[PDB]
Each structure stands twice: as C-alpha cells, then as structure tokens.
Write an enzyme that holds these catalytic residues in place. Structure first.
Site, mmCIF file in Angstrom:
data_model
loop_
_atom_site.group_PDB
_atom_site.id
_atom_site.type_symbol
_atom_site.label_atom_id
_atom_site.label_comp_id
_atom_site.label_asym_id
_atom_site.label_seq_id
_atom_site.Cartn_x
_atom_site.Cartn_y
_atom_site.Cartn_z
ATOM 1 N N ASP A 1 -1.143 4.422 -15.489
ATOM 2 C CA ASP A 1 -1.782 3.406 -14.658
ATOM 3 C C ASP A 1 -2.943 3.972 -13.849
ATOM 4 O O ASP A 1 -3.965 3.298 -13.652
ATOM 5 C CB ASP A 1 -0.735 2.838 -13.706
ATOM 6 C CG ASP A 1 -1.197 1.616 -12.976
ATOM 7 O OD1 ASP A 1 -1.882 1.762 -11.951
ATOM 8 O OD2 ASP A 1 -0.855 0.514 -13.413
ATOM 9 N N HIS A 2 -2.785 5.228 -13.406
ATOM 10 C CA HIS A 2 -3.739 5.917 -12.550
ATOM 11 C C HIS A 2 -4.870 6.581 -13.317
ATOM 12 O O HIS A 2 -5.796 7.142 -12.713
ATOM 13 C CB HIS A 2 -3.006 6.848 -11.570
ATOM 14 C CG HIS A 2 -2.059 6.137 -10.640
ATOM 15 N ND1 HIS A 2 -1.471 6.801 -9.575
ATOM 16 C CD2 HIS A 2 -1.639 4.846 -10.634
ATOM 17 C CE1 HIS A 2 -0.718 5.894 -8.961
ATOM 18 N NE2 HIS A 2 -0.771 4.713 -9.576
ATOM 19 N N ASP A 3 -4.820 6.475 -14.654
ATOM 20 C CA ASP A 3 -5.874 6.973 -15.536
ATOM 21 C C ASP A 3 -6.757 5.773 -15.877
ATOM 22 O O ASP A 3 -7.915 5.948 -16.227
ATOM 23 C CB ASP A 3 -5.257 7.576 -16.825
ATOM 24 C CG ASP A 3 -6.180 8.401 -17.726
ATOM 25 O OD1 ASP A 3 -7.399 8.388 -17.498
ATOM 26 O OD2 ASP A 3 -5.681 9.010 -18.696
HETATM 27 C C1 HEM Z 1 5.610 5.392 -7.722
HETATM 28 C C2 HEM Z 1 6.367 4.362 -7.629
HETATM 29 C C3 HEM Z 1 5.426 3.371 -7.343
HETATM 30 C C4 HEM Z 1 5.076 2.993 -6.150
HETATM 31 C C5 HEM Z 1 5.718 3.533 -4.913
HETATM 32 C C6 HEM Z 1 4.073 1.992 -6.370
HETATM 33 C C7 HEM Z 1 3.368 1.453 -5.311
HETATM 34 C C8 HEM Z 1 2.313 0.627 -5.504
HETATM 35 C C9 HEM Z 1 1.568 0.083 -4.447
HETATM 36 C C10 HEM Z 1 1.858 0.194 -2.986
HETATM 37 C C11 HEM Z 1 0.554 -0.577 -5.029
HETATM 38 C C12 HEM Z 1 -0.481 -1.371 -4.277
HETATM 39 C C13 HEM Z 1 0.178 -2.776 -4.141
HETATM 40 C C14 HEM Z 1 -0.781 -3.848 -3.641
HETATM 41 O O1 HEM Z 1 -1.271 -3.798 -2.545
HETATM 42 O O2 HEM Z 1 -1.133 -4.904 -4.388
HETATM 43 C C15 HEM Z 1 0.700 -0.432 -6.444
HETATM 44 C C16 HEM Z 1 -0.118 -0.951 -7.363
HETATM 45 C C17 HEM Z 1 0.017 -0.743 -8.715
HETATM 46 N N1 HEM Z 1 1.058 -0.221 -9.358
HETATM 47 FE FE1 HEM Z 1 2.686 0.479 -8.532
HETATM 48 N N2 HEM Z 1 3.861 1.735 -7.696
HETATM 49 C C18 HEM Z 1 4.665 2.607 -8.332
HETATM 50 C C19 HEM Z 1 4.889 2.773 -9.678
HETATM 51 C C20 HEM Z 1 4.203 2.064 -10.596
HETATM 52 C C21 HEM Z 1 4.489 2.128 -11.976
HETATM 53 C C22 HEM Z 1 5.595 2.973 -12.568
HETATM 54 C C23 HEM Z 1 3.581 1.266 -12.598
HETATM 55 C C24 HEM Z 1 3.417 0.978 -14.035
HETATM 56 C C25 HEM Z 1 4.236 1.396 -14.991
HETATM 57 C C26 HEM Z 1 2.728 0.765 -11.536
HETATM 58 C C27 HEM Z 1 1.557 0.077 -11.718
HETATM 59 C C28 HEM Z 1 0.763 -0.347 -10.657
HETATM 60 C C29 HEM Z 1 -0.543 -0.951 -10.835
HETATM 61 C C30 HEM Z 1 -1.255 -1.326 -12.055
HETATM 62 C C31 HEM Z 1 -0.989 -1.231 -9.664
HETATM 63 C C32 HEM Z 1 -2.385 -1.772 -9.309
HETATM 64 C C33 HEM Z 1 -3.360 -0.616 -9.658
HETATM 65 C C34 HEM Z 1 -4.767 -0.791 -9.191
HETATM 66 O O3 HEM Z 1 -5.100 -0.583 -7.923
HETATM 67 O O4 HEM Z 1 -5.635 -1.103 -9.963
HETATM 68 N N3 HEM Z 1 3.198 1.151 -10.292
HETATM 69 N N4 HEM Z 1 1.851 0.238 -6.769
HETATM 70 N N1 LIG Z 2 -3.829 0.323 -5.231
HETATM 71 C C1 LIG Z 2 -2.784 1.179 -5.199
HETATM 72 C C2 LIG Z 2 -2.174 1.554 -3.990
HETATM 73 C C3 LIG Z 2 -1.053 2.386 -3.963
HETATM 74 C C4 LIG Z 2 -0.474 2.866 -2.648
HETATM 75 C C5 LIG Z 2 -1.090 4.161 -2.212
HETATM 76 C C6 LIG Z 2 -1.278 5.383 -2.948
HETATM 77 N N2 LIG Z 2 -1.977 6.263 -2.248
HETATM 78 N N3 LIG Z 2 -2.252 5.679 -1.046
HETATM 79 C C7 LIG Z 2 -2.973 6.379 -0.022
HETATM 80 C C8 LIG Z 2 -3.524 7.635 -0.284
HETATM 81 C C9 LIG Z 2 -4.206 8.317 0.712
HETATM 82 C C10 LIG Z 2 -4.328 7.721 1.947
HETATM 83 F F1 LIG Z 2 -5.021 8.379 2.925
HETATM 84 C C11 LIG Z 2 -3.805 6.486 2.239
HETATM 85 C C12 LIG Z 2 -3.127 5.808 1.243
HETATM 86 C C13 LIG Z 2 -1.721 4.433 -1.004
HETATM 87 C C14 LIG Z 2 -0.544 2.800 -5.203
HETATM 88 N N4 LIG Z 2 0.566 3.586 -5.588
HETATM 89 N N5 LIG Z 2 0.567 3.659 -6.852
HETATM 90 N N6 LIG Z 2 -0.496 2.951 -7.391
HETATM 91 C C15 LIG Z 2 -1.223 2.388 -6.344
HETATM 92 N N7 LIG Z 2 -2.322 1.617 -6.398
HETATM 93 CA CA LIG Z 3 -9.485 7.239 -17.058
#
Ligand code: HEM
Ligand SMILES: Nc1cc(Cc2cnn(-c3ccc(F)cc3)c2)c2[nH]nnc2n1
Ligand SMILES: [Ca+2]
Ligand SMILES: CC(=O)N[C@@H]1[C@@H](O)[C@H](O)[C@@H](CO)O[C@H]1O
Ligand SMILES: CC(=O)N[C@@H]1[C@@H](O)[C@H](O)[C@@H](CO)O[C@H]1O
Ligand SMILES: *[C@@H]1O[C@H](CO)[C@@H](O)[C@H](O)[C@H]1NC(C)=O
Ligand SMILES: OC[C@H]1O[C@@H](O)[C@@H](O)[C@@H](O)[C@@H]1O
Ligand SMILES: OC[C@H]1O[C@H](O)[C@@H](O)[C@@H](O)[C@@H]1O
Ligand SMILES: OC[C@H]1O[C@H](O)[C@@H](O)[C@@H](O)[C@@H]1O
Ligand SMILES: C[C@@H]1O[C@@H](O)[C@@H](O)[C@H](O)[C@@H]1O
Ligand SMILES: [Cl-]
Ligand SMILES: [Cl-]
EC number: 1.11.2.2
Lengths: 103, 464
Positions: free
Chosen positions: A94-96
C-alpha cells in the site's frame, strides 16, 4: 525526457513516454466514476445537516462503525490459511502505491 | 485546527458522536479528521480531487522515496559503495537499522517518554506506524546494502551510482514477484486472478498506471486482516517474555520497541508464525483500531473504520450500487435483495438501518461486508477494484521486471528464484523461515524450514 534509459526515476516521471506524469508522485488521482459531493463539486455528503443523499439521511461513520464493525476482541476467528505477514505485506505494498496528503 | 477543535470549518471534517456511543459519552466531543488536500485549491470550475504523493508503480518507492531530495537524503553519499544510509546511533545485534528522522512534532517520542527514541526515516513517511511495518522496511534496507556489496565484489569497476541503481532495480523486481506471484492470488482467489490478472504478455503504453481515487479506500480491506496484538517470538519460535502479546494500542509509533526491545528478529518470527485475523461478517475489525487507534499519541483514540468511511465521503466517492454497476455486478435495491448478494440477511438488515438504500453504503463498508471468494480474502466488488488497479500497475509499467529489455533471460531466471523467507535469511539472525508460500504458512513447525534448504539469489547474470 530521455530516448534511452536503464533505470526508473525517483518520481516516476518518464515511465509513460506519451503522457510522462502518469504514475508519477504528487499528481491528482484518476477517477473511475464522477465524484458525488453535496454541492456537486466540493462539499462531502454529511457536511450540511438535513441534506439527504439519494433520498436518505447520512449515517454517521462512527454510528456505522458501532453497529456493523463492532465485535468482542476474544471472539476473534484466526485465519487457518494466512499468516500475519499477509496482513503486513498488504500495508507495505500500500505504501509503495498510494499516500494521500492532508494539511 | 482539526487536532483539537470540533468546529466543522475548512479543512476540518470531524466525525460527530452518536448517542449511546460505547466509548465517547460526551456528544460535544468528536473524532479529528483533516480533509485530504485538494488537487486544485480554492477552485469553482473543477470537481474536487485528491493527490497521490507517491509513485503508483511497485518500484519499492517506500524504500527509495518518490521525491528527489528525500531519495538523496536516504543514501550513504560518503563513498562510491552505492548503499542506503543506516542509523549511526543504534544497531540490531550487529545488523543495520533505518536512520532516525528529524521531525518537529515527533509522535514516536510520545510512546515511551523516558526512552527518548524518535521516528525512522524511510522511502515513505509512515515507516514507524507499527513495529511490524518498520521490520519490513529494515529487512528491505538491509537487502539493498546486501545486494550492493555482492555486486561490488562481482563488478569492482562500478561506481556508487551503478551500485545504487542496480540494487534498487533488483529490490524493485523482488517486490513485484512477491506481490504478483505470492500476494495477489491469495487476496483475489483463482477465478478473479484469471479474470483481472491473466498471464502478462508485454508493456502496453496505452494503459493508465495511475491509482484510482477508489483504490485508496478499497485496498483498506486489509484492516479486517489486522490482529489485536504484536506477537513476538524467541530463537526457538516461543513466546518472548517480557511482553509476548503486546496490545496494538501500545505498539503504534512505538519505534523504541524496535531499538530497545530486541530489534527486527522476534517481530518477523511473530509475523511468520502467527495467523492473520479472518474477516467474518460479525467480526469485521478489532477495537485496537476501532477504539484505540493512536491512543498513546493523540488527545483521543481514533476509529479506523469510521475514518475509512468519512475519507470516502471526503473523497467524493460514489456509493455501493454505483461501484457494483461499474464492476458489472447486480445492484440490490431492497433489504431482501441485499441479503441475497451478501448471503446474509442479518447483516443486510443492519446495513439498511444505517444507510436506508444500498445506494448510500460507503464503498469500504460495502466491500468488507461481501462474502469472500474461493481461496481469496475479498468479495466480488473489492476483487474487481483491487484486480483492475493491479493489472493497470503491471501492464502500464515500462520498468516491469518481465518486460523485454528490463532484464536479460538469465537475470529473469535468477529473479524467479527469490522469496520473502530467503530475504529474511540473508538479512537477519533467523535460521528457521516459512515454507513457501509465506502468506499461507502460519504454523510452527508444521509449515517451517531451515535456511540451508532455500536457494539464494544468483547474481551471476549481473557480472560485466
Ligand atoms: C499497520 C496497521 C495499519 C494501521 C495502524 C493503519 C492505519 C491507517 C490509518 C490511520 C490510515 C489513515 C486513515 C484515514 O485518515 O483515512 C490508513 C490508511 C490506509 N491504509 Fe491502513 N493501516 C494499517 C494497515 C493497512 C493494511 C494492512 C492495508 C492494506 C492491506 C492498509 C491500507 C491503507 C490504505 C490504502 C490507506 C490509504 C492510503 C493513502 O493515504 O493513500 N492499511 N491506514
Ligand atoms: N494516510 C495514511 C495515514 C496513516 C497514519 C500515519 C502514519 N504515519 N503517520 C505519521 C508519521 C509521522 C508524523 F510526524 C505524524 C504522523 C500517520 C497510515 N498508516 N498506514 N497507512 C497510512 N496512510
Ligand atoms: Ca511506488
Ligand atoms: C510506559 C512504558 O512502557 N515505559 C517503558 C518502560 O517500562 C521501560 O522500562 C523503558 C526502558 O527503556 O522504556 C519505556
Ligand atoms: C532503562 C530501563 O528502565 N530498563 C528497564 C529494565 O531495567 C527493566 O528490568 C525492564 C522491565 O520493566 O524494562 C526495561
Ligand atoms: C556509510 O558507509 C560506511 C561503510 O559501510 C559506514 O562506515 C558509514 O557509517 C556509512 N554512513 C551512513 C550514514 O550510513
Ligand atoms: O472493471 C469493471 C468491469 O466492468 C465490466 C467490464 O467493462 C469489464 O471489462 C471491467 O473489468
Ligand atoms: O476505467 C477502469 C476500468 O473500468 C472498467 C472497464 O471499462 C475497464 O476497461 C477499465 O480499465
Ligand atoms: O463483468 C463482466 C466483464 O468482466 C470483465 C471482462 O472479462 C468483460 O469482458 C466482461 O464483460
Ligand atoms: C489493462 C487493460 O485496460 C483496458 C481494457 O480495455 C483491457 O481489457 C485491460 O483491462
Ligand atoms: Cl475512482
Ligand atoms: Cl541517525
């Protein structure tokens, strides 16, 4: 934009020679369907009180979380055929691909 | 002002509190939410759209970066060895760690005040979010420097530029192979895999490799796979005391747990030998993310599934039926009809109470409610959104590992032999890794093997 290249750019610029920004960082997302906003262009559904969406009131995301998502932590069913590495490569992957900046 | 205020003034869109909420009893309070940055600020001509700050490609940009200044700041520029800079304050049993990040309001320091351990600096800004994530990041950082030293010994004439690039190119392919060969088929299942991802022929310059606004939400299906504890394991794959099953509400941003609680090794051991949570219609997501997301570092615990739903609304995403229509799937209009699609009327009645019409069901909520595909972990709709996006990322990638010219026939044959267990071998003290496929293997020792039984990446093809 070079005619011969061996490596990727860091920004993704030039991966698509015809439309060079495609796939590149810090650009607008593509849309697969037109956006549904309260005012047609910017305000999200739920912004204005009493404004219905397609003939019905807008349920609070937290209310939906409370009623549909919620379950007791101990009742958790573990996956017989998937390791936690599977619910981690997904986050790494997701982060790539995508990160949506906010102010 | 979003962090503190409850007022709905731009750019704040706070989630209001329903009556009789299980945790937040003060209804004058809320959940903080910042509206995603508009691609065109202050406009009245263009329909609001959001930005992707990263490269859409599976190019290991979370290792290398998506912006030129960061990408430079991530390398070791003090020599022509072509390596990625490592932490100069700490190491994990001799082995490398990601450098610290100079942040103004660093959240990692808030997880343990006395430890004074900050956030890490990686190709992506979210590296320190969960120790499990930081492990994968550190494993990949070690892998680049591993592949770069193996290449300098083979080709000593090569400078820091060719070393960095060639190793980056290798890692870039490694992420693609793990993703397309091992990850995705276990996400989609065989049928959707055949449907949305038929055998790659070649690069199509007419394929839009961009991330769709929807995918950003749809791919958050993974939130259902999240377990409530960080499971750590000792040398003999046994619960590591103290703190073997740590609650997730304590691990978010706890970078100190990687530095001061025994590095990457136990975490990876835990990830390999613990099963993931299974998505059930009565068991969607755990309260560690539904009630205590970022509790240690914030004024209030967040609700990730509610954030996901407010985010789609912020993003102007259409509802369930529109997306079903788009995917070529039946659009239920009534409770009964819905109960038929989901193969669950108890859930459909629940969903109808909230939304009124299956037209309004928020995309994430709809997607996660669907019964899973055969040998897959997503329903029909999400298999469509996720499938389509991954095919575009593959067929629209000029630097796709299988693309003619990217690698040589031998180079391609050498890369076909990689695996994530083998990467864990070459970059940690772990001697017992998961039997391939890594994503399916979850039981110790039934599903485990010794390092020795795994063939290494043969860099012979790279010799010049
Ligand atoms: C590490 C455990 C994880 C935590 C704690 C976590 C936390 C978050 C948080 C806080 C956000 C921002 C939410 C918002 O404000 O709308 C986020 C977004 C997201 N997460 Fe999760 N997430 C996790 C794992 C995953 C996994 C395993 C997937 C997919 C398999 C995923 C996919 C995404 C995607 C696509 C977004 C939006 C990305 C973007 O900014 O473009 N997350 N997640
Ligand atoms: N948009 C987000 C937002 C989050 C929450 C997140 C991850 N990093 N941070 C962060 C990182 C540095 C920081 F100074 C403040 C917040 C917030 C996600 N976690 N996994 N995917 C995410 N996508
Ligand atoms: Ca990439
Ligand atoms: C609140 C909390 O858990 N603090 C921990 C503490 O228990 C531990 O002794 C210390 C070691 O550096 O790290 C921190
Ligand atoms: C510097 C510091 O506090 N280290 C502590 C250690 O002394 C203690 O035995 C352990 C359990 O609390 O946590 C850590
Ligand atoms: C750069 O590499 C050399 C050799 O590996 C090492 O001694 C030095 O500490 C590295 N510096 C950084 C910032 O990683
Ligand atoms: O992606 C949505 C799907 O919709 C239907 C057809 O147009 C398919 O080709 C497509 O895959
Ligand atoms: O627009 C994205 C996707 O939508 C559906 C079909 O029309 C596909 O051809 C297309 O790739
Ligand atoms: O949903 C049906 C739709 O699926 C996809 C493609 O195979 C299309 O040709 C087909 O029409
Ligand atoms: C990746 C390609 O995208 C477009 C469609 O016309 C093709 O069928 C294929 O899905
Ligand atoms: Cl979209
Ligand atoms: Cl440092």
């Amino acid at each position: 934009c070079p005619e011969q290249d061996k490596y990727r750019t860091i920004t993704g610029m030039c991966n698509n020679r015809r439309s060079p920004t495609l796939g590149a960082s810090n650009r607008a997302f593509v849309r697969w369907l037109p956006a549904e906003y309260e005012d047609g262009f910017s305000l999200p559904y739920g912004w204005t009180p009493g404004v219905k969406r397609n003939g019905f009131p807008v349920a609070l995301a937290r209310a939906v979380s409370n009623e549909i998502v919620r379950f007791p932590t101990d009742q958790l069913t573990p996956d017989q055929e998937r390791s936690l590495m599977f619910m981690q490569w997904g986050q790494l992957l997701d982060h790539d691909l995508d990160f949506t900046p906010e102010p | 002002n979003c962090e503190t205020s409850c007022v709905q003034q731009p750019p704040c869109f706070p989630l209001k509190i329903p009556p009789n909420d299980p945790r937040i009893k003060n209804q004058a309070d809320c959940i903080p939410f910042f509206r995603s940055c508009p691609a065109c600020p202050g406009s009245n001509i263009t329909i609001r759209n959001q930005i992707n700050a990263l490269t859409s490609f599976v190019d290991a940009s979370m290792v290398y970066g998506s912006e030129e200044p960061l990408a430079r700041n991530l390398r070791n520029m003090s020599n022509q060895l072509g390596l990625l800079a490592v932490n100069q304050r700490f190491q994990d049993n001799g082995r490398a760690l990601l450098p610290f990040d100079n942040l103004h309001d660093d959240p990692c320091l808030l997880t343990n005040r006395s430890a004074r351990i900050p956030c890490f600096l990686a190709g992506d800004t979210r590296s320190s979010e969960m120790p499990e994530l930081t492990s994968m990041h550190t494993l990949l950082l070690r892998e680049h420097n591993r592949l770069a030293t193996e290449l300098k010994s083979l080709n000593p004439r090569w400078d820091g530029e060719r070393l960095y690039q060639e190793a980056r190119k290798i890692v870039g392919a490694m992420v693609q192979i793990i993703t397309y060969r091992d990850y995705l088929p276990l996400v989609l299942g065989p049928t959707a895999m055949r449907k949305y991802l038929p055998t790659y022929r070649s690069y199509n310059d007419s394929v839009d490799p961009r991330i769709a606004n929807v995918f950003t939400n749809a791919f958050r299906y993974g939130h259902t796979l999240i377990q409530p504890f960080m499971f750590r394991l000792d040398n003999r794959y046994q619960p590591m005391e103290p703190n073997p099953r740590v609650p997730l509400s304590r691990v978010f941003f706890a970078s100190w747990r990687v530095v001061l609680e025994g590095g990457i090794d136990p975490i990876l051991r835990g990830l390999m030998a613990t099963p993931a949570k299974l998505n059930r219609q009565n068991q969607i997501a755990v309260d560690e993310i539904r009630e205590r997301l970022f509790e240690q570092v914030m004024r209030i615990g967040l609700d990730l599934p509610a954030l996901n739903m407010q985010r789609s609304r912020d993003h102007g995403l259409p509802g369930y039926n529109a997306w079903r229509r788009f995917c070529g799937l039946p659009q239920p209009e009534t409770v009964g009809q819905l109960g038929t699609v989901l193969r669950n009327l108890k859930l459909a009645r629940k969903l109808m109470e909230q939304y009124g019409t299956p037209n309004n069901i928020d995309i994430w909520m709809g997607g996660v409610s669907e019964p899973l595909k055969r040998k897959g972990r997503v329903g029909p709709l999400l298999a469509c959104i996720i499938g389509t996006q991954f095919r575009k990322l593959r067929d629209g990638d000029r630097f796709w590992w299988e693309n003619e010219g990217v690698f040589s026939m031998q180079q391609r044959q050498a890369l076909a032999q990689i695996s994530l267990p083998r990467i864990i071998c070459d970059n940690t003290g772990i001697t017992t890794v998961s039997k391939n496929n890594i994503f399916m293997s979850n039981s110790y020792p039934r599903d485990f093997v010794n390092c020795s039984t795994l063939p290494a990446l043969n860099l012979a093809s790279w010799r010049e």
